[PDB]
């Protein structure tokens, strides 16, 4: 009645042995957690990263949020509070809203109340929050390196796999090997919460994993949907709020919304919940929709990552983006080829999985090139796509980031289409077209062979 909490998501308590390697651990829980989309990970009791900061010297620009269900909000873009003044505002808000000591409101009640107030148009509650990548004004909650002497305890956690700053540059996240500037994806985001500040339903760019660590404060309440129910959820969303689905003019205009999990559960979409408390991790799996809100003043840090498991999903995702005409954050094929070009220094399990994705890439590329030849495109020239800014190598039709090949035409200088959209570039006859390609098929097979040798198969 009014609000029925979804079932709880898995909670894992790894021993220090299991916890040592995050990628091994994530792989182990994967068959369980991917059925629920999110899961929680409680570190061993003696895993306490040192959090220390001056609350008066950390400052940030607050973002403002209206709280209406099904109302469109924009995904956060890449006034001023200090952490102390925000904290004071946030505690006062919650304390005044409930007329209770700010830390005495039951989590059950805030949740019930959150879903009441987002559904009631008579109640125009607005809240504020912080969201940004680390900077000089507000840095990572985890120990980093620079011109400040670290204690032996901080040095212990400097190189932890669970220090989210390390997640990008680690040798089991294929995002590490990307040389392209994708700071939005590789760098951790910092989130300063207050009561009811919320993140709308979304999945991660390129269907990556995400991992969220609650450093300090009141809990963060989560809802998660498993990857297999993604399109099921999207169907429901289109039905009740189709306005969210009109084509986005940019990646800076992605529309997302708050929507009651009971509404989803009513339409047979599986939904799980959890309250993430301070010192706990939440992990989201590929294409797992998730949303949530903060119980009160808190501080979280989150980062994207991609394991070898993800590679085939990454390819499927870029295909899905093409159908939707959605912009890519990076070129997936460019990443695969970058890794192939470094086959000798690759982890051997990585090499093996990259090899299989590369084989699919090459076979798809072979067929596409045969098709455009049959359309009468004859002229061709090698082109170093990776040197072009992304906005200079998107298919004018489906907006995909080109890398393996594209079609150009002297009639339309600087414009390109991917090989799926040869007809869409201009009205000139195809013999005026040019296939621009990064590699010949003859360059590609040896790159794939290097992977095979490194995989030792
Ligand atoms: C504010 C915001 C936006 C998008 C994702 C996330 C947040 C956070 N409050 C959080 O923890 N994840
Ligand atoms: Cl409202
Ligand atoms: Mn308190
Ligand atoms: Mn997310
Ligand atoms: Zn295209």
Curated annotation (Swiss-Prot):
It comes from the Eukaryota. Fe cation binds at residues 202, 204, 290. Ubiquitously expressed, with highest levels in testis. Down-regulated in melanoma and glioblastoma. Up-regulated in breast cancer (at protein level). One of its GO terms (biological process) is cellular response to leukemia inhibitory factor. It is found in: Nucleus. Residues 156-322 form the JmjC domain. Keywords: Acetylation, Biological rhythms, Chromatin regulator, Dioxygenase, Disease variant, Intellectual disability, Iron, Isopeptide bond, Metal-binding, Nucleus, Oxidoreductase, Phosphoprotein, Repeat, Repressor, Transcription, Transcription regulation, Ubl conjugation, Zinc, Zinc-finger. Residues 9-50 form the JmjN domain. GO terms for molecular function: DNA binding; histone binding; histone demethylase activity; histone H3K4 demethylase activity; histone H3K4me/H3K4me2/H3K4me3 demethylase activity; nucleic acid binding; sequence-specific double-stranded DNA binding; transcription corepressor activity. One of its GO terms (cellular component) is chromatin. Disulfide bonds: none annotated. A zinc finger (C5HC2) spans 395-447. 2-oxoglutarate binds at residues 129, 210, 212, 220. It is linked to Intellectual developmental disorder, autosomal recessive 65: A disorder characterized by significantly below average general intellectual functioning associated with impairments in adaptive behavior and manifested during the developmental period. MRT65 patients have moderate to severe intellectual disability, developmental delay, and facial dysmorphism. Camptodactyly is present in some patients. Histone demethylase that demethylates 'Lys-4' of histone H3, thereby playing a central role in histone code. Does not demethylate histone H3 'Lys-9' or H3 'Lys-27'. Demethylates trimethylated, dimethylated and monomethylated H3 'Lys-4'. Acts as a transcriptional corepressor for FOXG1B and PAX9. Favors the proliferation of breast cancer cells by repressing tumor suppressor genes such as BRCA1 and HOXA5. In contrast, may act as a tumor suppressor for melanoma. Represses the CLOCK-BMAL1 heterodimer-mediated transcriptional activation of the core clock component PER2. Both the JmjC domain and the JmjN domain are required for enzymatic activity. However ARID and PHD-type 1 domain are not required for activity per se but contributed to recognition of the H3(1-21)K4me2 substrate peptide. Belongs to the JARID1 histone demethylase family. Interacts with FOXG1B, PAX9, MYC, MYCN and RB1. Interacts with HDAC1, HDAC4, HDAC5 and HDAC7. Interacts (via PHD-type 1 zinc finger) with histone H3 unmodified at 'Lys-4'; the interaction is inhibited when histone H3 is methylated at 'Arg-2' or 'Lys-4'. This is Lysine-specific demethylase 5B. The lineage of its organism: Eukaryota, Metazoa, Chordata, Craniata, Vertebrata. The chain holds residues 26 to 754 of 1544 of the full protein.
